[PDB]
Coordinates of all heavy atoms in Angstrom, one line a residue:
Chain V
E38 N 86.1 133.4 81.7 CA 87.5 133.3 81.3 C 87.9 131.9 81.0 O 88.7 131.6 80.1 CB 88.4 133.9 82.4 CG 89.9 134.0 81.9 CD 90.9 134.4 82.9 OE1 90.5 134.8 84.0 OE2 92.1 134.4 82.6
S171 N 57.9 113.0 82.3 CA 56.7 113.8 82.3 C 57.0 115.2 81.7 O 56.1 115.8 81.1 CB 56.2 114.0 83.7 OG 56.9 115.0 84.4
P229 N 90.4 99.5 82.0 CA 89.9 99.0 80.7 C 89.0 97.8 80.8 O 88.0 97.8 80.1 CB 91.2 98.7 79.9 CG 92.2 99.6 80.5 CD 91.9 99.7 82.0
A262 N 99.2 110.7 82.9 CA 100.0 110.5 84.1 C 99.4 109.3 84.8 O 98.3 108.8 84.5 CB 100.1 111.7 85.0
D295 N 101.2 127.9 88.9 CA 100.4 129.1 88.7 C 99.5 129.0 87.5 O 99.3 127.8 87.0 CB 101.5 130.3 88.5 CG 102.4 130.1 87.3 OD1 102.1 129.3 86.4 OD2 103.4 130.8 87.3
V299 N 98.4 125.8 84.9 CA 97.1 125.3 84.7 C 96.8 125.0 83.2 O 96.4 123.9 82.9 CB 96.1 126.2 85.3 CG1 94.6 125.9 84.8 CG2 96.1 126.3 86.8
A317 N 98.0 103.3 69.4 CA 97.0 102.2 69.4 C 96.6 101.8 68.0 O 96.5 100.7 67.7 CB 95.8 102.5 70.3

Side-chain angles (χ1 to χ4, degrees):
Chain V
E38 187 189 352
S171 83
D295 63 14
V299 164

